Amino acid sequence: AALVVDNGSGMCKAGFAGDDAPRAVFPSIVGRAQSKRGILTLKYPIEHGIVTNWDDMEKIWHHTFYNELRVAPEEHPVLLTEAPLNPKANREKMTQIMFETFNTPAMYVAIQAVLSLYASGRTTGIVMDSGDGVTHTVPIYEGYALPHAILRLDLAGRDLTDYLMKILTERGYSFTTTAEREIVRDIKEKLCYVALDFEQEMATAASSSSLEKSYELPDGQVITIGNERFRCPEALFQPSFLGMESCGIHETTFNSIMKCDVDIRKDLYANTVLSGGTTMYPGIADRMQKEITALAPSTMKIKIIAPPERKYSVWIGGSILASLSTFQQMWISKQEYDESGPSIVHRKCF
Amino acid sequence: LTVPQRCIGFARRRVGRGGRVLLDRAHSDYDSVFHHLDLEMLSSKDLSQILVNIKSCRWR
Amino acid sequence: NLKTLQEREARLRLEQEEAELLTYTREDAYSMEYVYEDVDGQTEVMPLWTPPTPPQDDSDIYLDSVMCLMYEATPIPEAKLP
Amino acid sequence: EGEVTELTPCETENPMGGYGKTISHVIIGLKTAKGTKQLKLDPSIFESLQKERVEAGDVIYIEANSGAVKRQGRCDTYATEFDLEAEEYVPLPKGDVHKKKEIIQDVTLHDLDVANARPQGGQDILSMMG
Amino acid sequence: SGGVYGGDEVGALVFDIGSYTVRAGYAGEDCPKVDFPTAIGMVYYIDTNALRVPRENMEAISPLKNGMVEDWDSFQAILDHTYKMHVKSEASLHPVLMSEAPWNTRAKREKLTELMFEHYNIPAFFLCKTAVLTAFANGRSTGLILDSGATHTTAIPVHDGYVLQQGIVKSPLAGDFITMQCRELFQEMNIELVPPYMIASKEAVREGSPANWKRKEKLPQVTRSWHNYMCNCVIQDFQASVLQVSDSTYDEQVAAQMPTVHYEFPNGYNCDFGAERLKIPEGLFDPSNVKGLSGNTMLGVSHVVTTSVGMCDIDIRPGLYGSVIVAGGNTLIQSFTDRLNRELSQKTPPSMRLKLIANNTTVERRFSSWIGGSILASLGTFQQMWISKQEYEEGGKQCVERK
Amino acid sequence: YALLYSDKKDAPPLLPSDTGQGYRTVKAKLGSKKVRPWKWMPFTNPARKDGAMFFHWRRAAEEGKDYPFARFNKTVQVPVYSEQEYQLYLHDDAWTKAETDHLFDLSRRFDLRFVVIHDRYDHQQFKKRSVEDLKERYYHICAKLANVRARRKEQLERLYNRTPEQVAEEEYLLQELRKIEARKKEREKRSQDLQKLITAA
Amino acid sequence: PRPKSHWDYLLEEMQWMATDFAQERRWKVAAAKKLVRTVVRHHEEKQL
Amino acid sequence: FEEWFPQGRPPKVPVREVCPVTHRPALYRDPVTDIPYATARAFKIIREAYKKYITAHGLPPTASALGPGPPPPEPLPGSGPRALRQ
Ligand SMILES: Nc1ncnc2c1ncn2[C@@H]1O[C@H](COP(=O)(O)OP(=O)(O)O)[C@@H](O)[C@H]1O
Ligand SMILES: Nc1ncnc2c1ncn2[C@@H]1O[C@H](COP(=O)(O)OP(=O)(O)O)[C@@H](O)[C@H]1O
């Protein structure tokens, strides 16, 4: 009955609570009117995990409610998600448009990191959430997201796709347009794995051609991707490749853990959980474990946990939270919003 | 409380942000003797419920 | 079976250590009032902590509570001499 | 007393004999107005449970020593205004599940004499004329 | 009951600027969502991540000296970066409730107001003291705000919500002293090393044995001040991890018999300090035999509090002793609050109630200033005290009479 | 034991919130109604004393209702004397017109909080003054103004007797304070002995 | 004696807001703890 | 084992119906419209709305009655699955 709609950048995820996977998944892109590919004025309103304009946001709400799904929002409660650093004004406006426009009976906003932690089934840990447009490291203790300890990294699948485009174009492949950026993203999601110890993996790939793998384009073109397969996602650990001067994912996680309160960082290290579609690269778990063990003290028992449902872990967590009986008393009833206004979204949280 | 039939212990009514009224609580006497005190408000661990308080428990 | 009973009791105990109650049942408690009767059968109303009300006149004289830490009030009779 | 949530934790067959399927205990989730308290009663009572219409959501009147179950009726919380029936829905019990009801009855010796004088229970006593 | 007189939430981006760490966040929230180091990687890079990437120079500088902002350029850069990155909110869209120290000069205050109303054009502004907010954070109108920042320890008293400027006692004892003493101790027993900033990889090391590791071939980072900051990072980590405050006069008979505790340096070097881990947090309360300055004359925490109480009128001391407000980072050290309470009790004159607010359990003491600022902003009656753009553009631009 | 008194919060407690459970039970309860539109509208508080205007969350049904908290701005009753009034009535030797004006400005700003006034008092432009002295001056000026316009006698001597004695008491050394407590206990013992004597008679 | 000024009510409202924040922080923490514990218990129950 | 122990889910606490014309606890259920009601005026208004609906494919407007402070929805979409009277 209760709906779950995760505002994930790049592609929105929606469905009904209780299911083991989302039923509706589509690109979170709207054109003005149509939310499908084509030659239109399409624009991304949630590029970096924060709603920019609310027109396209309400449009994609109406879409995911009436076209993708066939359920009336005024008859079913909606479980919405928000970035771990979602500003107050945006949350208030979202609650307002959701209570007024669609007349939903009740709703609840939850931190995507906490939802992914629920999906992982852990009481504490760091949620390395890696969407398509933004990355976040959210330490969690007894369900509290520790907002002061949250750190944000401004690289994601979009920048990885751009860097892969750049590299494969430098190598001599036609990947300079969006019609080819889609094929590049397909390569990145299917091919373009992550290899640990790049200093030796690149040397081996350059000495031996066994790492070269072929790929077939829709137009019949065939190309071979090799050593640069894992060089693209290496930017996550060495943003210098991407051109920016920020810390890597592992360094950001270590910083977030250090900022956390003392006497509990042990349990945090012991429950480092990955999330987001950008973590689907095979072997990334071992690389993360090794680099964190190198950074973190040797006496610390680092443990990287990453279920195979990384991309949809947030949706699984939202479904679990909605189906949860004890969570039923936390819904923002319609009368509560009517009497208090959009500010009610603040209270009755966590 | 109204719908429940258990004494939540010491509490005080307070108005919060947004016009919503909250009910703070406190801890004392192990927080267990009061849960059993319902038998004294509805009408050792039996006289203690009558000595620790003057049966000034809030009805409804 | 004894070990199973022990572990079940432990598990149940762990459940009781998180939170007993978390809701107030606004349906009636939100608007309904609270009253009690002491041993002497005297009635009293439950004072709810509300924000400061708007003063309609010059009432509500300044109390200076921080001064009451050592003083209580001012009696009528005094020494009545130079 | 309280709303029942019947559940039988599967247990290995009688260890003295062979293998199969048995039930060593029967847990009843009596829920009262004050809270909930599961009782791991003796399994032999399962016959009484099945005897009366003891379904999840009704109030039962358990006895400590005897153990006989006497269903009072469904909870008023489920008594939808559109359901036409009486004497079947009863309110939830107020107070702890375990209740030690102390009742005193003052009757003169003549009352006991009269009570033990006439018969009661079948025996074709329903006749009118004779 | 509609609760019309509950409260109002109108922007009010609280910016509690601090010497160790700057804090920020919207009003009405309970915890600041923005918390990053205050020192900028001046070549400007100010972020928990940008301040840990090797580059050409990246000199570390703290704009606030002695809790007083002096380098206005770096301060403006920090504010702009914070807004743009963390808040993403237009400058002239929401008011600001920045905090200040009780010892802010008039000229510096006017310059801050000018920078707020000129380069940002914020719709409104209000600059409250840090002690006032710390008191409001605890719902106290009177009390001793024992600030223990990284550069100063001050028991500022407040009267009816107003700070007693003459009662402040700016004791040099602060986090910087503890960090310097820890650095000296390390240099005495071992060699202080940079965090993983330069360590490529570590290896297993026997407790007490010399550690072995690989050096990175990145930039040399000739700037020693940056190396000093990177070392102070690990020093503060050590302080907050294992360093513990004594609970008595610290006689050399019990410390030698207490349990031992371990700690691993960035390179994996394991060492124990169970014998003298409580020697450093002694000058804070008894600055009489510190090895650094043996011929000094300073006042401990309890002494500073007693002086701050005595320098004020006696009519308010009953409300000051009874509502001591402990705040700041140094306090989170183990046994610090207990030692302070014991010392104040044995020092405070009997017959006067002494009560320590129970707030050491959480780390919210540091954020007490921001919490108080958000609380003050969320009030409805306070909505009239904001310094609007009209009051400034009119020509007055006088925050003294308005605050 | 007895009931508890606490301002903010105790160690382990917890407060219950409102109910939002049983959507099925209350489905039609809240489905037959709607929500009053809430708008981020601009509001002008008359107590601003200027033309500034801010925003606030209010329902679109009460676009008016300038400000509820505006009626809380009650200024303290502080007389405002002119220069001639000071020259004729409030003239003094130790004090001067500028000093009295500064005192009155501080009083109006801090709402008759003589402690904060003395704290922020400009001891540079004017020689040091005591709290009791400022109080005496203010009350004398107020009484003179109320008289010429046509409240209770202020005694600086009393404050001269209260504050120094209470300070000397607060400065009681440990040994002398213990001796005072011992003398108090001895006086209590003497009182008990006198009670026993009068009862035995 | 004098009547309560603006700041006299402002400080009372400030104390009210402070206690409200204090209660709400603990409420959020307790709710989050309840949620995580219930979720992990549900996971264990499903596995069992 | 299944016969003597029918381990069924809870009774799925029903919905607390409400009268759409007066917003009070519904006491009756209109047969033809299959929507709860509590008063005779509510029954008449419900019958009139159902007649207006069945007249055309679907009533564009929605009948209004006893609108309280908050915006009343004037519930048309309270679908009555019951067919024609007879
Ligand atoms: N097979 C794959 N493996 C790894 N990453 C992928 C794969 N397919 C897509 N991605 C990237 O991971 C992202 C997952 O997006 P999503 O998790 O919905 O973002 P958000 O976290 O904002 O919801 C996609 O946006 C895409 O850039
Ligand atoms: N000028 C200042 N004013 C107020 N607070 C400050 C100032 N400088 C530093 N602080 C506070 O003092 C703390 C110092 O941190 P520190 O004591 O080293 O942390 P810990 O001891 O908990 O490891 C910071 O958290 C900061 O909030």
Swiss-Prot record, chain B:
Component of the NuA4 histone acetyltransferase (HAT) complex, a multiprotein complex involved in transcriptional activation of select genes principally by acetylation of nucleosomal histones H4 and H2A. The NuA4 complex plays a direct role in repair of DNA double-strand breaks (DSBs) by promoting homologous recombination (HR). The NuA4 complex is also required for spermatid development by promoting acetylation of histones: histone acetylation is required for histone replacement during the transition from round to elongating spermatids. Component of the NuA4 histone acetyltransferase complex which contains the catalytic subunit KAT5/TIP60 and the subunits EP400, TRRAP/PAF400, BRD8/SMAP, EPC1, DMAP1/DNMAP1, RUVBL1/TIP49, RUVBL2, ING3, actin, ACTL6A/BAF53A, MORF4L1/MRG15, MORF4L2/MRGX, MRGBP, YEATS4/GAS41, VPS72/YL1 and MEAF6. KAT5/TIP60, EPC1, and ING3 together constitute a minimal HAT complex termed Piccolo NuA4. Component of a NuA4-related complex which contains EP400, TRRAP/PAF400, SRCAP, BRD8/SMAP, EPC1, DMAP1/DNMAP1, RUVBL1/TIP49, RUVBL2, actin, ACTL6A/BAF53A, VPS72 and YEATS4/GAS41. Interacts with TRIM27. Belongs to the enhancer of polycomb family. It comes from the Eukaryota. Signal peptide: none annotated. This is Enhancer of polycomb homolog 1. It comes from Homo sapiens. It is found in: Nucleus; Cytoplasm.
Swiss-Prot record, chain C:
It is found in: Nucleus. Ubiquitously expressed. Belongs to the SNF2/RAD54 helicase family. SWR1 subfamily. Component of the NuA4 histone acetyltransferase complex which is involved in transcriptional activation of select genes principally by acetylation of nucleosomal histones H4 and H2A. This modification may both alter nucleosome - DNA interactions and promote interaction of the modified histones with other proteins which positively regulate transcription. May be required for transcriptional activation of E2F1 and MYC target genes during cellular proliferation. Component of the NuA4 histone acetyltransferase complex which contains the catalytic subunit KAT5/TIP60 and the subunits EP400, TRRAP/PAF400, BRD8/SMAP, EPC1, DMAP1/DNMAP1, RUVBL1/TIP49, RUVBL2, ING3, actin, ACTL6A/BAF53A, MORF4L1/MRG15, MORF4L2/MRGX, MRGBP, YEATS4/GAS41, VPS72/YL1 and MEAF6. May also participate in the formation of NuA4 related complexes which lack the KAT5/TIP60 catalytic subunit, but which include the SWI/SNF related protein SRCAP. The NuA4 complex interacts with MYC and the adenovirus E1A protein. EP400 interacts with TRRAP, RUVBL1 and RUVBL2. This is E1A-binding protein p400. The lineage of its organism: Eukaryota, Metazoa, Chordata, Craniata, Vertebrata. The gene is EP400. The chain holds residues 2200 to 2281 of 3159 of the full protein.
Swiss-Prot record, chain E:
It is linked to ACTL6A mutations have been found in patients with intellectual disability of variable severity, developmental delay, dysmorphic features and digit abnormalities. Additional features may include genitourinary and cardiac defects. The disease phenotype resembles Coffin-Siris syndrome and brachymorphism-onychodysplasia-dysphalangism syndrome. PROSITE patterns: ACTINS_2. The modification N-acetylserine is found at S1. The modification Phosphoserine is found at S62, S209. It is found in: Nucleus. Pfam families: Actin. The keyword DNA repair applies. Involved in transcriptional activation and repression of select genes by chromatin remodeling (alteration of DNA-nucleosome topology). Component of SWI/SNF chromatin remodeling complexes that carry out key enzymatic activities, changing chromatin structure by altering DNA-histone contacts within a nucleosome in an ATP-dependent manner. Required for maximal ATPase activity of SMARCA4/BRG1/BAF190A and for association of the SMARCA4/BRG1/BAF190A containing remodeling complex BAF with chromatin/nuclear matrix. The keyword Acetylation applies. Its main location: nucleus. GO terms for biological process: blastocyst formation; chromatin remodeling; DNA recombination; DNA repair; negative regulation of cell differentiation; nervous system development; neural retina development; positive regulation of cell differentiation. Belongs to the actin family. GO terms for molecular function: chromatin binding; transcription coactivator activity. One of its GO terms (cellular component) is plasma membrane. InterPro entries: Actin, Actin_CS, ATPase_NBD. It comes from Homo sapiens.
Curated annotation (Swiss-Prot), chain H:
Residues 62-84 are annotated as: Disordered. The chain holds residues 274 to 359 of 364 of the full protein. Residues 68-78 have a biased composition (Pro residues). The gene is VPS72. It comes from the Eukaryota. Phosphorylation is enhanced by ZNHIT1 and promotes the interaction of VPS72 with histone H2AZ1. This is Vacuolar protein sorting-associated protein 72 homolog. Component of the NuA4 histone acetyltransferase complex which contains the catalytic subunit KAT5/TIP60 and the subunits EP400, TRRAP/PAF400, BRD8/SMAP, EPC1, DMAP1/DNMAP1, RUVBL1/TIP49, RUVBL2, ING3, actin, ACTL6A/BAF53A, MORF4L1/MRG15, MORF4L2/MRGX, MRGBP, YEATS4/GAS41 and VPS72/YL1. Component of a NuA4-related complex which contains EP400, TRRAP/PAF400, SRCAP, BRD8/SMAP, EPC1, DMAP1/DNMAP1, RUVBL1/TIP49, RUVBL2, actin, ACTL6A/BAF53A, VPS72 and YEATS4/GAS41. Also part of a multiprotein complex which contains SRCAP and which binds to H2AZ1/H2AZ. Belongs to the VPS72/YL1 family. Deposition-and-exchange histone chaperone specific for H2AZ1, specifically chaperones H2AZ1 and deposits it into nucleosomes. As component of the SRCAP complex, mediates the ATP-dependent exchange of histone H2AZ1/H2B dimers for nucleosomal H2A/H2B, leading to transcriptional regulation of selected genes by chromatin remodeling. It is found in: Nucleus. The lineage of its organism: Eukaryota, Metazoa, Chordata, Craniata, Vertebrata.
